[PDB]
Each structure stands twice: as C-alpha cells, then as structure tokens.
Symmetry: C3
Subunit: 341 residues, 3 copies
Amino acid sequence: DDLKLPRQRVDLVAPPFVHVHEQATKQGPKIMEFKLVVQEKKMVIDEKGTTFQAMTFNGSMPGPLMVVHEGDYVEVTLVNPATNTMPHNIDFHSATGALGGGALTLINPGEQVVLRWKATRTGVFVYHCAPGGPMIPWHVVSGMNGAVMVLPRDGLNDGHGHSLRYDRIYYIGEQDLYVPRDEKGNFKSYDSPGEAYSDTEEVMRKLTPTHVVFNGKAGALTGKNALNANVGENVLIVHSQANRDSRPHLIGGHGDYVWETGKFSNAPETGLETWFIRGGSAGAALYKFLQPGIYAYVTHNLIEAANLGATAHFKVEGKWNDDLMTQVKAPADIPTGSTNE
Amino acid sequence: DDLKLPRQRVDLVAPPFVHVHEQATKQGPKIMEFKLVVQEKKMVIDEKGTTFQAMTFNGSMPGPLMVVHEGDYVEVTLVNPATNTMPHNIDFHSATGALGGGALTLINPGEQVVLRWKATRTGVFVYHCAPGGPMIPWHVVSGMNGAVMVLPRDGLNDGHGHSLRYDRIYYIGEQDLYVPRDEKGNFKSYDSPGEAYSDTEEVMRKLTPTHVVFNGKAGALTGKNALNANVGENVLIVHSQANRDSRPHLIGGHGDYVWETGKFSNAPETGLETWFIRGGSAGAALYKFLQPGIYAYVTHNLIEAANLGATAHFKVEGKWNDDLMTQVKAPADIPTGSTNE
Amino acid sequence: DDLKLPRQRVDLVAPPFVHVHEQATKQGPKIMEFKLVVQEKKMVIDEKGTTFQAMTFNGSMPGPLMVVHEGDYVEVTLVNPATNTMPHNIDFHSATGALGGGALTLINPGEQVVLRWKATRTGVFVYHCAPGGPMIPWHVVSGMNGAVMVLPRDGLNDGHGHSLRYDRIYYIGEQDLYVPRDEKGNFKSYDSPGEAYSDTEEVMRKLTPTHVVFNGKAGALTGKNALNANVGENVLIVHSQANRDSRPHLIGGHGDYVWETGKFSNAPETGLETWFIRGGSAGAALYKFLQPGIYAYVTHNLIEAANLGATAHFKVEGKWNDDLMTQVKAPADIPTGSTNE
Ligand SMILES: OC[C@H]1O[C@@](CO)(O[C@H]2O[C@H](CO)[C@@H](O)[C@H](O)[C@H]2O)[C@@H](O)[C@@H]1O
Ligand SMILES: OC[C@H]1O[C@@](CO)(O[C@H]2O[C@H](CO)[C@@H](O)[C@H](O)[C@H]2O)[C@@H](O)[C@@H]1O
Ligand SMILES: OC[C@H]1O[C@@](CO)(O[C@H]2O[C@H](CO)[C@@H](O)[C@H](O)[C@H]2O)[C@@H](O)[C@@H]1O
Ligand SMILES: OC[C@H]1O[C@@](CO)(O[C@H]2O[C@H](CO)[C@@H](O)[C@H](O)[C@H]2O)[C@@H](O)[C@@H]1O
Ligand SMILES: OC[C@H]1O[C@@](CO)(O[C@H]2O[C@H](CO)[C@@H](O)[C@H](O)[C@H]2O)[C@@H](O)[C@@H]1O
Ligand SMILES: OC[C@H]1O[C@@](CO)(O[C@H]2O[C@H](CO)[C@@H](O)[C@H](O)[C@H]2O)[C@@H](O)[C@@H]1O
Ligand SMILES: O=N[O-]
Ligand SMILES: O=N[O-]
Ligand SMILES: O=N[O-]
Ligand SMILES: O=N[O-]
Ligand SMILES: O=N[O-]
Ligand SMILES: O=N[O-]
Ligand SMILES: O=N[O-]
Ligand SMILES: O=N[O-]
Ligand SMILES: O=N[O-]
Ligand SMILES: [Cu+2]
Ligand SMILES: [Cu+2]
Ligand SMILES: [Cu+2]
Ligand SMILES: [Cu+2]
Ligand SMILES: [Cu+2]
Ligand SMILES: [Cu+2]
C-alpha cells in the first residue's frame, strides 16, 4: 500500500448528466475510484430506427463524464464481461504514460484490470478505447469514448483573477458514425460487431459519416429529453469529439467563456458565436441564459445538424427581456406604397 | 414608443464593399434601421457559366455587411416579396433570444416583419435564414447568409491598450455550394428552387461541395473586380462562412492582427500566415500592405482555391521594397560546373 | 553589392531531422544561404508498396526545414534540373511580396533562380511550389512543400517572460495524397507526373485523400525509424500541412507549450491534449517527456492515423514513474462475487 491517501468511490451517471461533485474544494488529494463496464450491443441511432453494432463504456454513447480535481489520483476498474466478443482497453488523454493507459489495460472478455493515473493536468479530456492498429478507429467510432474533467482545486476562473461558478453542467458527446448501405442506399443491419466490420471499414475510409449525433442518436436531446435551464443560470456545456472536428453553437445564445482547446490553465475566450472542438479533444463553454424559450445547440455545419442528427435543445424557463430583443411589428402584408427593389 | 433613442436609416451596399460608418464614435446609442429584401433567383456561380437556384438577402451572395456599435439597437425590416416561392426568416448570431430572431421573423411570400435586437456583443457575426428542420441548411447553402460587425464605440484595439484603425474594409463571404450532376457528370439546371431541392439535398448529405466561392461565384473578385489597396494602408478583411470551415491566407502577405473567432473582446493574434474561420462564424484580419503587386486571397485548401472557385485578388499600388524581397539572379541556365544531387 | 552583411551557407538535412542551428544568438543579422533542388520521381507511399508520381524539394516529402533568426536575410537558390519535365517555383509564407516569392522564382527544367527575403516575422511557416492556376494544388499535393522556422534572436519564450529551450527538434511534414484507383479499387501506376495528372485531379476534386502520411509514406517514422528521446528532454515538434487541416496528438503525452497557429509573437497555450494545424500552415509543440516507452504521434482523426498512414512513433528511454501512472492490478478473471450491470 505505497499510496496512503483517502479513497472515495464515485457512482457514474448517464450523459448528459454528471455525477455529484464539488467545484472548489479544500479537501486534499484523494484516490477517486471509478468503474467502467464495456457493453457491446445493437443500438438505435436515428429517428427512422436505423440500428448499428455499438461498443460502449457503461452502456452509453458517450461514456460517462468523470470529474476529479487537480492532484487527485484516478483509480479505474475496467471490466470486459464474457458476453462481449472483443478485447478492449482505455486511453485517458488526461493521463501521462503507456499510451494514456491503453498499454496497461488490454482485457479479453471475462477479464478486468485496475489502472491508476495522477490528474496532473487541468481541463476536459477525451478517454477512448484503443486496442491497436485498425481496431483503434473502429472501436472509437463504434461508441467507445467519453470524457473526464479535471477541475482546479479552486474551481474555474476567467484567467484574469475572477472565480467562475456554474449552476448546472451538461456533457454533450458528439459521435460520427459510418453505417454501411446496400446497393439501393438502405442502411444494412448485422448480427454482431465482427460481421459489420468489413463493410463499416469501407465507409470509414471515405471519411464521410452517415450520422453525427449527440448522446448516441438523432433526437436524443430534443423533445421530452431537451436540456433544462432557467434565465440567470450559468451553464457549463462540455463537448467532446474523439475522432472528428465539431463547431458548437448555441442558437440564440453565445459562449460567455469558452475553452475551445479545453484546458483550464489557459484563459477562456469571451463572447463567441461558434467555437471549435478539434477531433480527439474536449472543450467547454459557460453561458448565462438571458432569455427564456427553446435554444438549439448544434454543430454549425448545418447539414450535419439538421440532416445527420447533430441538434440538441435547451428549454429555458423565465421572463422575456424586450430590451435585448423584440418583435416590433408582427408579420404583415407588404404595404402597397412599398418599393422593394 | 417605449425606446426613446435617435433613429438612423442605413443604406446597405453590395459586398465586398461596406456601407459608410464611423470606427470610433462619441455619439450615444441609436436605433440603426436596416432593410433586407429576400430575392430567389437563378445565378451564375462559375467561369463555365454553371447556374443554380439561389436564395439571397438583397440579391447578393453574401448578403450585405451591416455595421453598428456596441449598445446600438438594430431594427431590421425583413421583406419577402410575393414573387418568391418559400417562407424565409433571419437569425443573427449577434443577437440574444428566439433562435437569434428566427423564431420572430418567419414570413411567407407577400409579408414583412420588423425585429429589433440590442448589439450587446462586439465582433463580426454571421446572419442567416433558418426556416426550420432541413430547410435550415438548404436556405443557407442556397446563399441566405451574410454578416454584421459590432464595433466597440472606441473602435478596434490590439488588446494591449493601442488603437487600431483601418484605411479600407472589405467583406469576403465564402459560400459552399452543392450543385447536382447528371450520370455523365455535367451540372443539372432547374426552373425553381423547389425543383432543385431533392437532388441538391443528396449532394449536401455527402458533405463535399462542388464549388467554394467568394462573393457568389468563381472569379468574382479577380480580374477587373480585384480588390484595390495601396502600400501603407491598413486593410480590414472580414471573412464569413455560415456552414463550413475555411482557412484564409493572403498570398505574399500576413495577418498583422487576426481575430479568427471574430470577437473584439479577445486580443487578436499577431503575424499569422493562415487563419481559421469555423463554419457558422465570421472572423477578421488587419494587414498593412508593405509591397505593391497582385496578392491572391484564398482558402488554403488549394484544391478549393484553384479548382472549386475560392480565390480573390488584391491589386496594390506603390513602390517595391527590395530590402524585404529581391530577385538576386533572374532565371538562368544551371552553370556547367554545378553539381545538383 | 548593396547588402553588406556576413554570409553563412547552410547544409540542409532530410526530415525529420533538422540542420545544426543556435536557439538564442548574439550574432547580428546574416545572409543565410540555402539551396533547394527540385526532384520529380516515383516514390513508395504505403506499406503495400503503392507508388505515385511525386514532385519534391531536395528529394524528400516534406522538403527540409530551414532555420534562421528574426532579421536574417534568406537567400535561396532554387534549381530545376533538365531531367525534370515541369516548371517549378517557391512561395515562402514567411516572406513579404510577389506571392511569397512565387512571382520571382518560376524556372523551367534546366534553369535556376536566386531569391532573397528578409525574415521579419517569427514562427514556423510553410513553403511550397505554386506555378499558377490548377498547377498550384497539384504540385503541393504531389509533395512540393516544406517549412521554415524563424526564431526570435533570444530563442523561444513562454509569452510570460521565461525562456524555453529544446533539447531536440523534429520536423513532421504531413502530406495528403490523392492516388487514382481503377474500376476494381486498385491504385493505378503511371510512367510520368503528366500522365497521372488528369486522373489525380478527379480524385483531388472530391477533397478526400487516399493517404495521409508523415515524412512521405505510411510507416516512415515507425519501427526502426521511430523518433528517439529520453525522459526529461524538452522536445520541439514542428508540424506542417500545406493543403489540409490536421489535429496532432502525442498519445501518452501532452503539448506543454503549443503555438497551434505557429507564430512566436503569440504566447503558447499550455497543457493541450490535441492541437490544430490549419491547412496552409505550420505549428509547433514543446513537450518534456516524463515516462519512458513508445508514444504514438497521430493526427487525431483516428481513421486517418491508423488506416490512411498518419502515425509516427517516439521511443523514449528512461525509468518509469509509478506516481504518474501504475497498473494497480494486472488483467485477471472477473471475480465470481462481482455484479457488473
Ligand atoms: O507549464 C509547463 C509544465 O508542465 C509541467 C509543469 O511544470 O508539468 C505538468 O506535468 C507535470 C507532471 O508532473 C507537473 O509539474 C505539473 O503540475 C503539470 O502541469 C512540466 O513538465 C512543465 O513546465
Ligand atoms: O441516401 C441514399 C438513398 O437511399 C435511400 C433508400 O434508397 O434512403 C436511405 O438513405 C437516407 C439518407 O441517409 C435515409 O434517410 C434512410 O433511412 C435510408 O433508407 C434513398 O431514400 C436515398 O436517396
Ligand atoms: O464577459 C462575460 C459577461 O457577458 C455578460 C457581461 O457581463 O453580458 C454580455 O451580455 C450582456 C447582455 O446584457 C451584457 O452585460 C454585456 O455588456 C455583454 O458582453 C454576462 O451575461 C457575463 O459576465
Ligand atoms: O466532374 C465529373 C466529370 O464531369 C464532366 C462532364 O462529363 O465535367 C463536369 O465536371 C467538371 C468538374 O466539376 C466541370 O469542370 C464542368 O463544368 C462539368 O461539366 C467531366 O469533364 C468530369 O470528368
Ligand atoms: O505587430 C504589428 C506590426 O507588424 C509590423 C510591425 O510593426 O511589421 C512586421 O513586418 C514589418 C516588415 O518590416 C516589421 O516592422 C516588423 O518587425 C514585423 O513584425 C507592421 O507592418 C505592424 O505594427
Ligand atoms: O478501397 C476499395 C477496394 O479496393 C481494393 C482492391 O479491389 O483494395 C485497394 O484499396 C485498399 C484500401 O485503400 C488498399 O488497402 C489496397 O492497396 C488497394 O488495392 C479492395 O481491397 C477495396 O475494398
Ligand atoms: O476540510 N473541509 O472541507
Ligand atoms: O446512449 N447514449 O446516451
Ligand atoms: O480489440 N479489437 O477488436
Ligand atoms: O457628439 N459629437 O460627435
Ligand atoms: O452575388 N454576390 O455578390
Ligand atoms: O421555408 N422553407 O423552404
Ligand atoms: O558574438 N558572439 O557570439
Ligand atoms: O521522402 N520523405 O521523407
Ligand atoms: O508547372 N506546372 O506543371
Ligand atoms: Cu473497445
Ligand atoms: Cu486519443
Ligand atoms: Cu430563406
Ligand atoms: Cu447559425
Ligand atoms: Cu512544382
Ligand atoms: Cu501558400
């Protein structure tokens, strides 16, 4: 027992929600214990019911958000149940050495492993499966990716000596999918990941996804699963993309404070319209809602947003501010005396 | 009449030019009145005469640049003449609430609407049509996008307490187009936007444009329409892309001061070769010309620049500086005594 | 002889290595003399032996890294031997005027030219061939691109008044290739660049590379050609991409200090997971190795990394630090008493 620190078990929750944590803490470093269970399963990924052979951490795309503080140790038990067909591992971009932990975590079905990494670098970071060779992109684009947030012990700041505190946090994992089609253009179904591989790899090679989704499917965060907020709340939106670039935008809002490269040692940028998540990274945006109503959160390639699945909704309760925006005149017939050339 | 401020009507001009404005102002906030008239029309988009069914604000791709100051109110009359076939609206990324104004501006042919938004955020911002669902990307990639610049009341600064002033401003709107082809590879023509939709959507879904153009067509800002400047002038180049990333570069020059995310609350970066406009944003670069001659302004995917339409020219008058660059020896035969392995 | 400065001849070396230079210097400005010889040749670009008709500076993809200091003059002799078939030139993104020098350097086979440019802007910069029109992207994606680094005379700094010094430097040139295929999907071979052009241009137009390689071929910097380092060394990794975006990541490491836009007048960002090289630029990352072993350096589109060629290896000698990372329990059977739902 070389490392003599208190241990705290964390119970992960499904995205887009985040497990209970403190922003600022005066507790000393701890060993933060997490469990991730690989689950291969067929999943529905669009509003027409298209299925595909997914591979997940903890049954979700993305995998759950892990939250720790700078100087904590993160002890992760990775479990690969014998119902799975493939070997799996885990690479933490937050971690130092052994390909992020991938070189120390390769497990066959029926096995588990325990990795410990010190949280020396602050920010939001991707984690993903990376078995080796062509299996690396396949496992990642099959769903095996999530994120971890390493907070400064004093919480977030604006890079100019002022504390920032969020009232709410959501984790938006964006997933690029490569679903094979038949000669007529219909999506193909398979009985196992292995059976889907060869056809999937051919789609992957042309670098054009068939779907780009938040929280694992088109429409996942719309309708009854819209994200809630209230006028005045400061909301942190963590966005990850393990394989492909994204350009997040909150329609009707802004990024008040944005860490587009995702690392809290760097001052955020202010007042952004659209920000950029480089493939293989996580970023974070804070926004204080000023108006009630529906907001769309998109990647601002609008073809991907509207036609390939990459739109979420916020439903924000409160009172409308006519000073910031008003409909001066409702739609009305163009006046007869108008000249509109 | 709740809002008791002076009103000023602005007459928009066609890009790449910009309407008359002040950089720094000591005037107080005003209500700045703008009119945008939707025009659906067939337009020529390449040097071989390819046409396509465009949808525009004020008859241009991009729509005109609107320029106001922080704290002004922007009162926009959007007009959809009865000669048009589709409903249209407007989303200002500069604005707060109601999906940028889209939720308050949906008008059928024969209607107009008046929206007012407070200019609380400084920078250059996209505006675009966003009717709903799949119509959002279609209207945007059909040409319905422009930009607005919200200047600080004191004008631009270098983020380190020094004023920056431009001698000239140009607005470069970049447009990704998705023109259908027949089985032989020739571009298809249609009699209406509605007729073009189904085939266009199929091209859009594969996320590869057929054309990438500045000011609405290949060659628009070359030849007799090159952009003018003079040695010593500080030129602001505003660049927008409503749907797709771009990587601007001034061949033979630099970005002296670049706001790649486009927001003046952030200090610019200095001395860039190439900068990055994330899809769904505007950015801005200042450059002081040091040499006369022709400059090419490109997106630095050179296939897009040279082969899909995305090159503009500057023609810069003045005297050559041999200290910065000189041809020491003109092309000459390789000397006989040379060894060139 | 207007310009009365000392002259120093530099002998270039093949990437990923870099010619001998000083980081900080107290020498005054000099005329730094470089020679680049164009070589058109067939080259092997993947592990299955696929060939293609390359065009290079000095026989390598990328062309060699040139290193000078701010205020030096760079006198480049460009040679186009009569064994070549095409005209060639050179555009330095570091240079001011005449399209970066392209407008002063066009040479036919059998000719040479001498260009001098003043190194007024600090950073890493692309150089590339740019003959005119469609020949520009073709020559660049055929291999005619490299980089130059213009160091501050005091060496690198952290943007906060502290010197940074590298123990080692590597230059990683990333190349997007567009190799034609026959109706069965096999790569086509040609006897000359001219013969390959028409088919290559058709691939280029669809903006999807067939290969994305470091140092000119899949596997170039893996196996016996892995990059060496030692625990404790600060390694500068210069990354260029003349045509297409990249997202570098050091698997198991970080970017301690990253200039993603590549320009040393801007403070670096700290502690990045993944950074972004915009097409038509160079960037640079410093990392101090903390753990021994194999590291993969990738573009973090993992399909491109694992399946299209874009992976390099570092082999790092030293002692493992169990505090930063440890395997707490090796892979073992899932305990009978476990519940893993
Ligand atoms: O800021 C640059 C810095 O990163 C360093 C910090 O000095 O270390 C990072 O990783 C180390 C792992 O132990 C820690 O010192 C540090 O707390 C963390 O940010 C150096 O390697 C370098 O100067
Ligand atoms: O996309 C090609 C072509 O395929 C068809 C079926 O023949 O539709 C498929 O592709 C659509 C777009 O991805 C999906 O909306 C649908 O689930 C799928 O069957 C055609 O309708 C389409 O033109
Ligand atoms: O700098 C962060 C800041 O944005 C705020 C300014 O305090 O507001 C922005 O939008 C508001 C709309 O009224 C204005 O206060 C402000 O002038 C503008 O930049 C906050 O919501 C937050 O601190
Ligand atoms: O691009 C496919 C194929 O189509 C042809 C006509 O058969 O040319 C078309 O496409 C060209 C590239 O976009 C355009 O230059 C031209 O306007 C268009 O007819 C072929 O020439 C080409 O191989
Ligand atoms: O920092 C902005 C600055 O770039 C300037 C420097 O004043 O010049 C750059 O190019 C010039 C070429 O002579 C040099 O003055 C300078 O050393 C270099 O960084 C201006 O044109 C402008 O303020
Ligand atoms: O990629 C299309 C198709 O072509 C084949 C040969 O018919 O393989 C070629 O393409 C592969 C992927 O790029 C390469 O691995 C190989 O060198 C090449 O012959 C098929 O195997 C493949 O499905
Ligand atoms: O140690 N107190 O939270
Ligand atoms: O299945 N993912 O939220
Ligand atoms: O672990 N690879 O399928
Ligand atoms: O109020 N004067 O410009
Ligand atoms: O048609 N646009 O400039
Ligand atoms: O308004 N949509 O076509
Ligand atoms: O001038 N001395 O290095
Ligand atoms: O051939 N290039 O390293
Ligand atoms: O110089 N062009 O082939
Ligand atoms: Cu896996
Ligand atoms: Cu990774
Ligand atoms: Cu419209
Ligand atoms: Cu938008
Ligand atoms: Cu060339
Ligand atoms: Cu260039």
